[PDB]
Amino acid sequence: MRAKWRKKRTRRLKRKRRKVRARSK
């Protein structure tokens, strides 16, 4: 990927992880 896209995909994964964490808490 472009490093730009890798960063964006990682950001979306972080967003999903934070949503799951907020649901769990």
Binding site for RNA (CB under 7 A): 3, 6-7, 10-12, 14-15, 17-18
Percentage helix, strand, coil, to 5, in the chain?
90, 0, 10
Least distance from C-beta 5 to RNA, angstroms?
Answer: 10
Cα separation, 7 vs 9, whole angstroms: 6
Residue number, 3 or 23, with CB nearest to RNA: 3
CB of 24 to RNA, least distance (A): 11
CB of 20 to RNA, least distance (A): 10
Question: Residue 18 CA to chain centroid, in angstroms?
Answer: 8
